RNA sequence: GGGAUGCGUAGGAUAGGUGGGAGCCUGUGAACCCCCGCCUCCGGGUGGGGGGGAGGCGCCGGUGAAAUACCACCCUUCCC
C-alpha cells in the first residue's frame, strides 16, 4: 500500500473538504503527528502568482514568535574581522572564500547561509547554481547578505526564517513542533501568513492565498483558513 | 473523486519542483521468486495476485546542481 497503518489512523482525524480555523488546526495538530520524534508543524500556500514572472516572485522572512523548536545552524561566509562578529553572533560555522569548497565537496549541514558582501562574487560564481533556485544564495533582500554580519545572524537565531515560492507557485515553511502547545502554534501560523502577505505582489493576478494547509512532518495535512 | 506519469551525466538507479524529515515500513506479511494489468526514456517503473516467512528502507557514506525512506503543497503528461 500506499501510505503504513500509522498513516492511515490519522486520515480518519482529518475531514479533506473543511477549511479549519487556525486555532482548529492548532489543536488538531498533535493528534496528526504520530510519528516517534517530534514532527515539524509546516504551513503550505499556493499563491495567486504566475511564478515564472520575477516580478511576481515571493521572497522575504518573518521572524516566528516561537521559533523552529530546534537549533538552527547558521552557515556565515565573511572576509577578515567578520570572521569573528559572525562567531560571537552564535554562528555555528565561519570562515571565507575559503569554505566554498567545503559547501562544493556537499557539506550541507546549515539551516541558513549568510554571507558579507565582499564574498558574494565567490559565492555567487560557486555557490550559485547550489544554492540559486532554492532562494539559499545569500541575498540583499532576504537580508542574508549585508557587513552587518553579527545582526543578520542575532536574528536568524532569534526565530527568522526566510521563505521563497518554488518555481510552480506554492511556498513552504516550517513554522515550529507539533508539541508546541496549540496557542503557540498559531502565533508562529499567524506571524507566517501575516509575512507571507506582506510581500504579495503588486498586481499579481488573483486571490493571494489560493490555498493554505498545515501538515505535519509525516502526518496529514488541514487545510485552514488564513484569515483565523 | 480516484489512478497513472516524472529517467541528461555521475550514482545502487527512472532523482519532476519546492518545503518538511531522523527515522520509516513490516502476521494489515520484509528481502527474494513468479504471474497479470498498466506505463516505458527499453534501463526498468508501477498496481494487483501468488509463492516465501522476517526482514527491508532511510539517515550516515558515496555520486551529484540537487539525495533517496517518510510526509506536504504543487506542476507536467495521460487514464478511468
Ligand atoms: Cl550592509
Ligand atoms: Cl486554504
Ligand atoms: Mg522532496
Ligand atoms: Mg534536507
Ligand atoms: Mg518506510
Ligand atoms: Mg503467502
Ligand atoms: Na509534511
Sequence with gaps: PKHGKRYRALLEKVDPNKIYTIDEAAHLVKELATAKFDETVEVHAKL??????????????????????????????????????????????????????????????????????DVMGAVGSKLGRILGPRGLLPNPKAGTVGFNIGEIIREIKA????????????????????????????????????????????????????????????????RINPHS
Aim: proline share 6%; glycine share 12%; charged share 30%.
Design 48 to 117: 495567486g502568482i504566475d511564478p515564472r514572472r520575477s516580478d511576481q516572485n515571493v521572497r522575504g522572512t518573518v521572524s516566528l514568535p516561537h521559533g523552529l523548536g530546534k537549533q538552527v545552524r547558521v552557515l556565515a561566509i565573511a572576509k577578515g574581522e567578520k570572521i569573528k562578529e559572525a562567531e560571537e553572533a552564535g554562528a555555528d560555522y565561519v570562515g571565507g572564500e575559503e569554505i566554498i569548497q567545503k559547501i562544493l565537496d556537499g557539506w550541507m549541514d546549515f539551516d541558513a547561509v549568510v554571507a558579507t558582501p
Design 159 to 222: 526565530g527568522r526564517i526566510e521563505f521563497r515560492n518554488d518555481k510552480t507557485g506554492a511556498i513552504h515553511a516550517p513554522v515550529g513542533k507539533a508539541s508546541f502547545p496549540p496557542e503557540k502554534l498559531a502565533d508562529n501560523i499567524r506571524a507566517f501568513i501575516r509575512a507571507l502577505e506582506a510581500h504579495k505582489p503588486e498586481g499579481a493576478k488573483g486571490t493571494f492565498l489560493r490555498s493554505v494547509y498545515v501538515t505535519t512532518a509525516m502526518g496529514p495535512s488541514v
